[PDB]
């Protein structure tokens, strides 16, 4: 069925339709990955209907993996210190976010890390899921730990929505500006109501919002694409997860070299 | 029906309440759905939607319009599980302020509904004390109800001028037995009702009747039998004042 499953736990909040479910040496040193994932569960659409979506788990781990067997362990943050939310309907790995669960369920507040920067982190990471769309594109604590990062000439990983994230560097200096990424591409957005993966349309769209700051999105399909700008490394979709950890392992081994 | 605590698929490891179980004004609401409990599982609880409806219903007639506010800012979380008015106003609970953005800013209250979700945060929130520090210190009302009163605890490592203050409040013993007929997957990591006398409050019940209280600016209730009632009172307070 290409309906919208119900979300009994919030009001007027779908679940991706049934249809669409199934579609769809290392480095001894250390320097951390902060990783900022998503506190929000809940999207709003355009016909004030929720998308039940949060941060996408294959993404967030996969890449997670590849750099904990490279030696490069990871730390949590949300915007409000509320517990990681994952699309658990997109859920080896297994084991690794078992024994890993505790982190993204209680992690730090980003404000706090943000004010103890100047620091052994490696790079910062941003997961896709549309959970992504929620929040961290207004972040000014975002904000301000992607101008540490890039100022500090450190790692920037993303993918998916990952992205929106950067759109917080909107108003002030926007590090980020002339820099190129794969994004999970807007033309996609518009056409997943059709098989019920939403129950609504987005509100905005944050690839064209990313133009006007000057990204360049390279891609306008999605493949896996995995891309490299100096040190800021993106993937296209829940395809190119792999791929991702493969390049952030690779590139950040390499510098650390 | 069962006391199987029913399952949350939207969270990992998430349970509704058993299905046998489940049968200006300034509004400090809960952001975040899902409580620990002792056993790691996931209690999906929240703002109480009838404890936080009827009083404000009451309130909100005789003409005090009420306005919404979270500790992060993202949307009010309520215990949809059973458990017009709403929808009307819905869109203020979905889209509330920052608590400590309105801080720094008027209103007629602090109203702290029930829910176990007020267990979350509030009890903590360096905002929410300094809210509350302000509606005492200004001769303001405090309507508060169930586990409402927990956020009073944010009070805590201050001065607190709550201090004395007797309420009406969820007894911990209710919460110590809930478990064993579903309404949570597990038991609570603290209880609240100890912490508040702690601090020094009058916790004047023992029981659930739906009993409310008045001391000076300060009006509770004591579970959703009491939301009713509660909302009666709040409203001749702020009226005949």
Redesign the interface.
């Known amino acids: 069925s290409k309906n919208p499953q119900v ?5 007027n909040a779908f ?1 991706p339709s049934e249809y669409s479910l199934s579609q769809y040496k290392p480095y001894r040193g250390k320097h951390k990955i902060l990783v900022i994932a998503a ?4 999207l ?1 659409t355009d016909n004030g209907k929720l998308f ?1 979506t949060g941060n996408h788990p294959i993404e967030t781990l996969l890449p997670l993996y590849h750099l904990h067997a490279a030696g490069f362990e990871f730390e949590v943050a949300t ?2 210190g ?2 990681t939310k ?1 699309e ?2 997109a859920m080896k790995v297994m084991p690794f976010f078992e024994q890993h ?1 505790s982190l993204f ?1 209680n992690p730090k507040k980003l404000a706090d890390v943000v004010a103890s920067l100047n620091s052994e982190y490696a790079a910062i990471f941003v997961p896709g899921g549309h959970g992504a769309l929620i ?1 961290l594109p207004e972040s000014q604590d975002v904000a301000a730990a992607l101008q540490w990062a890039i100022k500090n000439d450190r790692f920037v990983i993303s993918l998916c929505h990952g992205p929106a994230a950067f759109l917080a560097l909107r108003h002030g200096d926007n590090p980020l500006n002339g820099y190129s990424i794969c994004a999970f591409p807007d033309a996609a957005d518009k056409q997943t109501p059709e098989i019920g993966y939403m129950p609504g349309h987005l509100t905005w769209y944050f690839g064209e919002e990313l133009k006007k700051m000057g990204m360049n999105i390279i891609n306008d399909d999605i493949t896996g694409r995995v891309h490299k700008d100096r040190k800021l490394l993106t993937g296209d979709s829940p395809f190119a997860a792999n791929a991702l950890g493969k390049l952030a392992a690779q590139e950040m081994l390499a510098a650390y070299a």
Do not use: H, N, T, V
């Not at 979300?7 to 009001?11: G, L, P, T, V, Y």
């Not at 506190?39 to 809940?42: Q, S, V, W």
């Open positions: 979300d009994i736990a919030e009001d679940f506190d929000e569960r809940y709003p039940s915007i409000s509320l517990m994952f658990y309907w669960k369920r929040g």
